[PDB]
Amino acid sequence: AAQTNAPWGLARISSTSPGTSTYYYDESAGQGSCVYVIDTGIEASHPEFEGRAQMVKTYYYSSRDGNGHGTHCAGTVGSRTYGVAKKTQLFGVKVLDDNGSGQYSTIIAGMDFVASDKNNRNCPKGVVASLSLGGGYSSSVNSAAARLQSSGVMVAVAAGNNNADARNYSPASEPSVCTVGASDRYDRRSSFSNYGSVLDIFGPGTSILSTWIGGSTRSISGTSMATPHVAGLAAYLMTLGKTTAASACRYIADTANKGDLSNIPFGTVNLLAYNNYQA
Numbered sequence: 001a002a003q004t005n006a007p008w009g010l011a012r013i014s015s016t017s018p019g020t021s022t023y024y025y026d027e028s029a030g031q032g033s034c035v036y037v038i039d040t041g042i043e044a045s046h047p048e049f050e051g052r053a054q055m056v057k058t059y060y061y062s063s064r065d066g067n068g069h070g071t072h073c074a075g076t077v078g079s080r081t082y083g084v085a086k087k088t089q090l091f092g093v094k095v096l097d098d099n100g101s102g103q104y105s106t107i108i109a110g111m112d113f114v115a116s117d118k119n120n121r122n123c124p125k126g127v128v129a130s131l132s133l134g135g136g137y138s139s140s141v142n143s144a145a146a147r148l149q150s151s152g153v154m155v156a157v158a159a160g161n162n163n164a165d166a167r168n169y170s171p172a173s174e175p176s177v178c179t180v181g182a183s184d185r186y187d188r189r190s191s192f193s194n195y196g197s198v199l200d201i202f203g204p205g206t207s208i209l210s211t212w213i214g215g216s217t218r219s220i221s222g223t224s225m226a227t228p229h230v231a232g233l234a235a236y237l238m239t240l241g242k243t244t245a246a247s248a249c250r251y252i253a254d255t256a257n258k259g260d261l262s263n264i265p266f267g268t269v270n271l272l273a274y275n276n277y278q279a
């Protein structure tokens, strides 16, 4: 299948060169898999989700996304027009408030929640967890991320936007999960993207168009936008039967476009997420 005039990030992931505008993908499009977006919530009623999205847990007064960040990330994972895995099932867990902030204890609770909750869901092709969040190093937060991954969920986390070594940032510094850096449409590391040896892969993160609250759309930037590109790609590859939750990150790195990125510091991988689609 092919989405013509697709957002640059989607075209990039199914391309071997920058500057193309068609997103080529397998029609299975991630159906049968499930992706938990642990963020500010998801506007499930948005037309772009076609009823494939649902709030599953809040840690605040309401489960609605009053911020937009979570809805944006979810859209990149699996909305019809802006998503990587267009037929995946989306579950929202609101651990961040409408200002986009949350405390470590509730973020940890949200992760433990997902590890348990996936056991009551029908996700035959696999389960993915997308975490476009993070803060200063915390061994408890890293530990919660490692537990989720070991429970059998493919965990993808943002590297962070401090243009620094991701080793001092928690979600990102946990070695067992998939740490995602950001790149722009000219194949340069995004100027805000953290880097370092803990990064596993890079994904499109600068000026990413996706869904927004109020049934709208908006273009924003961040490793927060790169993360869902690979969470969505993992779901897509899992329903294709190419990999499993435990090895998806390594599989994505193994099959990535290598050496294409510029502005990559020595010691940081030069790998860009690639679906390897051949029609």
Ligand SMILES: Oc1cc2cc[nH]c2cc1O
Residues within 6 Å of the ligand: 069, 096, 100, 101, 102, 132, 133, 134, 135, 158, 160, 161, 222, 224
């Ligand atoms: O990168 C991000 C990190 C955190 C940490 C808490 N909320 C966040 C939202 C972000 O977009």
Ligand SMILES: [Ca+2]
Residues within 6 Å of the ligand: 016, 017, 260
């Ligand atoms: Ca090339």
Ligand SMILES: [Ca+2]
Residues within 6 Å of the ligand: 174, 175, 176, 177, 178, 179, 198, 199, 200
């Ligand atoms: Ca890793």
